[PDB]
Amino acid sequence: GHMSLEEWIKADSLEKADEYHKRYNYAVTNPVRRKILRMLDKGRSEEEIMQTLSLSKKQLDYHLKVLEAGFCIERVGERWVVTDAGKIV
Amino acid sequence: GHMSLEEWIKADSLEKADEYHKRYNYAVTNPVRRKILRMLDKGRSEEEIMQTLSLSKKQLDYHLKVLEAGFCIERVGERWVVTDAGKI
Numbered sequence: 001g002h003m004s005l006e007e008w009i010k011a012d013s014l015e016k017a018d019e020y021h022k023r024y025n026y027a028v029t030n031p032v033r034r035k036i037l038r039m040l041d042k043g044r045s046e047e048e049i050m051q052t053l054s055l056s057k058k059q060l061d062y063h064l065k066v067l068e069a070g071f072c073i074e075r076v077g078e079r080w081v082v083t084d085a086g087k088i089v
Numbered sequence: 090g091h092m093s094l095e096e097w098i099k100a101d102s103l104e105k106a107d108e109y110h111k112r113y114n115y116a117v118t119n120p121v122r123r124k125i126l127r128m129l130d131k132g133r134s135e136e137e138i139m140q141t142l143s144l145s146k147k148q149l150d151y152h153l154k155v156l157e158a159g160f161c162i163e164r165v166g167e168r169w170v171v172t173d174a175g176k177i
Contacts, residue, residue, distance in 0.1 A: 020101070021094075
């Protein structure tokens with residue numbers, strides 16, 4: 001009966017948490033992405049980030065997408081903001 | 090960093106748990122559905138269920154949709170199987 005539902009909820013939570021950890025870990029274990037995070041947190045422009053990291057618009061866009069999927073940044077208007085999850089040391 | 094991620098993950102888990110509870114609770118709080126579950130659990134056919142409960146296939150299929158959405162039955166090949174959650 002109702003207590004057994006907790007098995008379904010457990011399985012789902014384990015699956016989701018696995019996915020979330022994978023996405024976060026993928027985002028943060030890349031030194032270029034770590035520098036993007038530090039620069040965004042200092043309010044650096046996308047142009048300066050591209051110049052300093054030698055990234056094309058496409059390459060930066062890719063890294064931003066990964067950071068967003070890994071819960072490290074969120075957009076407010078036209079600016080990417082580093083989240084609590086994205087703030088490392 | 091990681092502690093903030095964990096706080097979010099916990100909150101997400103509780104949210105999706107509440108969603109699962111909503112779906113299950115809806116499924117089991119209908120006496121026609123409760124009888125459908127008891128009958129499936131005893132190996133009754135959909136045809137027997139339709140006859141015994143005076144349901145059209147359309148009505149039975151809708152109940153089965155609701156039970157599936159609420160984790161009370163799962164499909165195995167051609168058969169709807171009652172899960173431990175659906176054994177009341």
